[PDB]
UniProtKB/Swiss-Prot annotation, chain A:
Belongs to the RNA polymerase beta chain family. It is found in: Nucleus. It comes from the Eukaryota. Component of the RNA polymerase II (Pol II) complex consisting of 12 subunits. The binding of ribonucleoside triphosphate to the RNA polymerase II transcribing complex probably involves a two-step mechanism. The initial binding seems to occur at the entry (E) site and involves a magnesium ion coordinated by three conserved aspartate residues of the two largest RNA Pol II subunits. Present with 18700 molecules/cell in log phase SD medium. This is DNA-directed RNA polymerase II subunit RPB2. DNA-dependent RNA polymerase catalyzes the transcription of DNA into RNA using the four ribonucleoside triphosphates as substrates. Second largest component of RNA polymerases II which synthesizes mRNA precursors and many functional non-coding RNAs. Proposed to contribute to the polymerase catalytic activity and forms the polymerase active center together with the largest subunit. Pol II is the central component of the basal RNA polymerase II transcription machinery. The chain holds residues 99 to 135 of 1224 of the full protein.
From Swiss-Prot, chain B:
Belongs to the archaeal Rpo10/eukaryotic RPB10 RNA polymerase subunit family. Keywords: DNA-directed RNA polymerase, Isopeptide bond, Metal-binding, Nucleus, Ribosome biogenesis, Transcription, Ubl conjugation, Zinc. This is DNA-directed RNA polymerases I, II, and III subunit RPABC5. There is a cross-link at K59 (Glycyl lysine isopeptide (Lys-Gly) (interchain with G-Cter in ubiquitin)). GO terms for molecular function: DNA binding; DNA-directed RNA polymerase activity; zinc ion binding. Zn(2+) binds at C7, C10, C45, C46. The keyword Metal-binding applies. Component of the RNA polymerase I (Pol I), RNA polymerase II (Pol II) and RNA polymerase III (Pol III) complexes. Component of the RNA polymerase I (Pol I) complex consisting of 14 subunits: RPA135, RPA190, RPC40, RPA14, RPB5, RPO26, RPA43, RPB8, RPA12, RPB10, RPC19, RPC10, RPA49 and RPA34. The complex is composed of a horseshoe-shaped core containing ten subunits (RPA135, RPA190, RPB5, RPO26, RPB8, RPB10, RPC10, RPA12, RPC19 and RPC40) where RPA135 and RPA190 form the DNA-binding cleft. GO terms for biological process: nucleolar large rRNA transcription by RNA polymerase I; ribosome biogenesis; RNA-templated transcription; termination of RNA polymerase I transcription; termination of RNA polymerase III transcription; transcription by RNA polymerase I; transcription by RNA polymerase II; transcription by RNA polymerase III. InterPro entries: RNA_pol_su_RPB10, RNA_pol_suN_Zn-BS, RPABC5/Rpb10. It comes from Saccharomyces cerevisiae (strain ATCC 204508 / S288c).
UniProtKB/Swiss-Prot annotation, chain C:
Zn(2+) binds at C7, C10, C24, C27. It comes from Saccharomyces cerevisiae (strain ATCC 204508 / S288c). DNA-dependent RNA polymerases catalyze the transcription of DNA into RNA using the four ribonucleoside triphosphates as substrates. Common component of RNA polymerases I, II and III which synthesize ribosomal RNA precursors, mRNA precursors and many functional non-coding RNAs, and a small RNAs, such as 5S rRNA and tRNAs, respectively. RNA polymerases are composed of mobile elements that move relative to each other. In Pol II, the core element with the central large cleft comprises RPB3, RBP10, RPB11, RPB12 and regions of RPB1 and RPB2 forming the active center. This is DNA-directed RNA polymerases I, II, and III subunit RPABC4. The keyword Metal-binding applies.
């Protein structure tokens, strides 16, 4: 789910309202299980 | 978005009649057309004034700080 | 007695200056507004 990975800070769970004000991008994480072989 | 103090077109105050009107409605269970009439709102200018107002403010209040 | 800022959610007066970041005491919500003026403003009434 959407989140703000800002530096000098953890990672807030971003809500639209804030992205709007702060000029951020209501986006989220793309994870994929790679296989090393 | 609050009740219009006084009617645009003619002048009669209407600032107060809101609560009254909203009451002769849900309680005394009358129909709008009449409720207005009860409230002294004869001619349609002052009449459309109350009958059409959308009291948005009530939502505006449901916000926070 | 005197204020400088405020929090969007936890509407609580702050007051700061350069260096101390721009967050709040308790909830991060790093926004903050800027509280009215002391010199009251006047309005025509028409
Ligand atoms: Zn009228
Ligand atoms: Zn705060």
């Amino acid at each position: 789910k959407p989140m703000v990975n800002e530096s000098d800070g953890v990672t807030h769970a971003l809500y639209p309202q804030e992205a709007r004000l702060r000029n951020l991008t209501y986006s989220s994480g793309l994870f994929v299980d790679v296989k090393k072989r | 978005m609050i009740v219009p103090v006084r009617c645009f077109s003619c002048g009669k105050v209407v600032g107060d009649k809101w609560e009254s009107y909203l009451n002769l409605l849900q309680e005394d269970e009358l129909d709008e057309g009449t409720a207005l009439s009860r409230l002294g709102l004869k001619r349609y200018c002052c009449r459309r004034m109350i009958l059409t107002h959308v009291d948005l403010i009530e939502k505006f209040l449901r916000y926070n700080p | 007695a005197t204020l400088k800022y405020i929090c969007a959610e936890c509407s609580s007066k702050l007051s700061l200056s350069r260096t101390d970041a721009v967050r709040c005491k308790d909830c991060g919500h790093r926004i903050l507004l800027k509280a009215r003026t002391k010199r009251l403003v006047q309005f025509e009434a028409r």
